[model samples]
Target: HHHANIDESKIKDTVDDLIQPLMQKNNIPGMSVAVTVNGKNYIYNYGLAAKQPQQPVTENTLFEVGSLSKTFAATLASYAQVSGKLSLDQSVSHYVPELRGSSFDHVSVLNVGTHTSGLQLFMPEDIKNTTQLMAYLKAWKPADAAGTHRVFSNIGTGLLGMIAAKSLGVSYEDAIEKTLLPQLGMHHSYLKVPADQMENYAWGYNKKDEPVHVNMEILGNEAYGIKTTSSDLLRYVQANMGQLKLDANAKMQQALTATHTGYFKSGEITQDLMWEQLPYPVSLPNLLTGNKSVATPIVPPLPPQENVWINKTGSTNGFGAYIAFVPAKKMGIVMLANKNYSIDQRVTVAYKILSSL
Candidate 1:
């Protein structure tokens, strides 16, 4: 079911009020936000990408969006499917023959992309290097029966990067930078940080406020490693607002709808590509209670959950980002922070403010 479209002014004011205080209280050095409704977008900028007084955050300030990059990975797969080089149902093993020898044969590439493959939450114990990626797939050892459950797995998503690379005939980095972003006119975005931009990139930080290395490449962050501006991201959001450019076959709209429909369920939420239903449980304590909790157990998909929200959240050493959008309402909330907040708090902030909107 669709939600009543709230006025943009109300949303803007509410979000600004809700977010500004938190940014100040937490010393968030930089942030950029964008909200979209029915394909139109509103953007706001605050703080400094660099804590230095001269470097203010702007609509153009590129950020390390962290795991928010998964959406791009998922989009790559969807675009591939629309082009007919990939099918959602076929085993991932079919396209990448190297994976044929592994348990990945039992896992659909589509299921992996949707986080319904039941792949383990982390890489398998035996996975140690690039070669082990296939070995890890062979030993996938699902946390639950495949397709019977949803388990958020970085392994599953990393395989998404691999899938995009193999299916698109290039690396995930190339596919996103060369093909995907260009198509969306996201000219400022990129999958991997280039050399020239290195100096200006914000250093990821730990809780203690010390500089830290952003280990995005470690988890095969092709599932998440992207640095972009809220503005570029807003462009992507605008395209996703049901206004996607047509493929030669006019299947782009259909693909987006397919992504909106919960292809699989895990716990109270449903999984669709990188997006998952925002499982807001009344049982959990709020931020005011000091008990931080977000994720709950997996449950089968329920069709009647009309008021539920679908979203995804990501964090790296120094960055945190969240996207909560209701397709039924054609509305989305995008929030980014220069600090790495706990997953629970990030989800809390995203949903709380979204509820306000």
Candidate 2:
């Protein structure tokens, strides 16, 4: 069941042709791509990591994955729920009481994960510290009712991480770096890139090919601070696709499974925590306009066993990342690049490449 009828040479050739042009056209400095079919892994590295003292990108090269970090936050929260550390239905204020007396009183922990909490995309720039963030959470109002709408909210996801951290009595970064990453066997992944790993960290390039770095934000660590190699990301994807032996730990397996469960609808798509789901043979339009509904609307759940596609996209100012997998097919691809590329282009390339598999 885990074997693929893939033509390795042809697949690599197609990928090379597809990526080479995209890289040249976009002026990308470097990229690492990983694909997993059944239980086997294939990795391709291209371009230079740094212009000075030039370093080639490799499987070990680390790149910032941006909002794809949300999936880890979702996984951690779901694990907490399964381990009896947190309750999805409970009010977020129950964990972070500082959010009391605001619209969050009516927003459940579940709402935050699904981006249906109606929280805004971000906090005001003035809300820089925890105290300011708390005040903002208390003062902010929801544009729609909890579980009624789907707007891709970084702030809402960050709050979820904060609540999970609160429940664990640790900082959001510590919660993931200390517990979640290790549990998933992602030893090479980092919420905070250590000094020793700095050399392997890839230099990201802006539109002008000027080197840039992501600024630390109030919730940056939890929302988009992950720096990881394609090797580690594929392992994370494998866990999500159920190819790993997580069954040895029942709680972890349950939590991983829970993250894939769809809880809401966004037009033709389905929402599962941070991951978006589409039925097999997904369309280009839905892939581009993800959860971008004009109004937040609560949608009913689909049957639990429906065979579908799951994926997440991420980017900072200078780098872009995307991952998509079909559990039913036991296949997935992870793409990371130093230069920002349009989501449409990423999806188009991924769809074309994955279709061949």
Candidate 3:
């Protein structure tokens, strides 16, 4: 389903000056934006996914996109490491052999998609499924040793999305609804919430903004869990800008440049595979002081001229999300937020409009 020939208004005046000062400094009630260039799909919406009878926010307003579903579980472990079935330096006990001899033997599904497996950033209410995530990977233990750097750990991307869905025999919701949304056409996307569309979801909020409703029992969709929109993430950033019609090749363009590589480089977040990297003034402390503060006295180093960027942010317990892209202006951006602002200002206004495009 490759559909090249893009160009939706070159960027539409930078997505109308990037959501007009974020809808006037956070009076935010509705927003569902989408933009994808080089493969077309420029969408927009501003306020009303339900603000006391308002309603507006379209492009299929669902919004739970948190941890941007760990870049779709690191694009399903680089599409199962380019379909050789799996071998990011082997040893996930060769597809979960109860972690053979603990300490994850010699962990590597590329160290659980670059969180530098040594696992355990959060988990241990006695774990919980996949037989308690393999008994926390057979009595886990790693405070920093393997690949010692970036630490964004979503339980090492939810155990590399449950070992890439048991090395692809299926069921990570059938590998994102039957194999990565039918190889990227992504029809109205979902991460699991199908009681007949659960009354068109979108009702989360927490950083004291109130309402919240999760607990699909120990959050089974794993780690940061899913729930999407913005025209199903603008058909997943227009199938990473080549318009994936369904399984196009070059191994999905090297699993979309391995989701914008940058593996391990913290402080202003640069960690890859579960996708998160920020080049502009080092991701401006998650959009100007909102990613939990103390971003090394306000980031400034390692190439910041035109602010190269890559992003992924998602929240749960009442949704808030963001996704930004700027493969040197082949651009992409999305800002889904039902409530819960909590740092991650749509990747600080998407690298300040990809650093002025």
Candidate 4:
């Protein structure tokens, strides 16, 4: 599967034409771009994984995938729902009794997963461990009533994973890496890349061009803690497109289907788990402007759109990543860069390439 399928000149030419200039413009040191057309997949790697080590980026290179991890975490939560371990309609308080008397008592699990729980974008700056995390939630207050407004927060979605794992009688890490990942055939993706796998983990760069990795603190695993190869990530995208032949686990398939089921409409975006859905056949200009946790009122779930684009973006101080797939189109793209860069550029680059296909 690592090898190219038939080596189409058109696909390579289109991606090369677009990506080379992008890397040059941003001074990005490493990148892995994967494109899928139904069952066929193409992986194109570029630049250096670590300049000091003089390593070239390859299909196996793993990059920190920022909030793009949210999608995987969200999938774990969805799978929990499928397996009868949790319900989206339930509140955070139901699973974590510690938050029973706090604002989360009024916050449905759906609210947390969808950014409507009124939780802020992050845990308080001072919280560093489970004790503080427990205390913070026990005393936390929301600025908006639950399900009223979408205010994106790591605490919200991260808590969703925590709740799902606890309800499933496991830790967030085990629920994701131990269960969900393997079911999806993503053996190379890791919440913590094992020592043996470190050789393939790419070095991420900062503005000064020094290498760095994402800091993993409390709620980090449930939030943005996944590092994966472009090939594995594209397999995930293929699963979303209902094309991955990796497994036939019915519950996991349903979990993937549930993640795409839309809820809450705001402007052109429809929120579903952590994935954002845009009206497909959308123009490049439209794709360039996007949001998180809209200030709009919640709307009922819309029927699945054949022309819907489901996508997510993730980043750390050093890495930038984006994944997008349109199931009806049977097309997807994953762009991972070692240097954290503007998402607009990533989106535009992906739009141009997907449109070309």
- Give the alpha carbon lDDT tens digit for every residue of 196-295 in model 3: 7555566665667665665543434656667767877766765665456455466755666665555456565665566665654454655454251111
Ranking by lDDT: 4, 2, 1, 3
Ranking by TM-score: 4, 2, 1, 3
Could you tell which candidate, 1 or 3, scores higher by lDDT? 1
- State every prediction's TM-score relative to the real structure: 0.80, 0.93, 0.33, 0.95
Q: How many clashing residue pairs appear in each of the predictions shown? A: 4, 4, 11, 2
Candidate achieving the largest TM-score: 4
Model 3: CA > 4 A from native: 1-28, 35-39, 48-64, 83-91, 95-98, 101-122, 126-135, 139-157, 161-204, 211-222, 225-236, 244-315, 320-335, 340-357
lDDT of each: 0.66, 0.83, 0.65, 0.86
Compose the digit string of candidate 4's lDDT tens values, residues 294-336: 5454456665566888889999889999998888889999999
State the lDDT of candidate 2 residue by residue for 1-357, as single tens digits. 123545566568778989999998888889988888858888989998887889999878999899899998998898888888899889988777777777878998888998888877765677678888877788878766777777788898998888887787887888899888988889889987899989999988987888887887898777788999999999998888667895387787777778887777777778887888888767777777752354333345454343777889999988999999888888889999998889888888888788878
lDDT of 1 by residue, 121-180 (tens): 665555567776665566656545567665667777887767866787987777878877
Candidate with best lDDT: 4
Estimate the overall C-alpha local distance difference test score of candidate 4. Answer: 0.86
The worst-scoring run of ten residues by lDDT in candidate 4 lies at 291-300
Give me the runs in candidate 2 sitting further than 4 Å from their true place.
1-8, 289-300, 303-306
Pairs of residues at least 3 apart in sequence or in different chains that clash in candidate 1: 103-138, 221-224, 267-298, 267-299
List the RMSD of every prediction in angstroms.
5.7, 3.1, 18.6, 2.4
Q: Name the candidate, 1 or 3, with the larger TM-score value.
A: 1
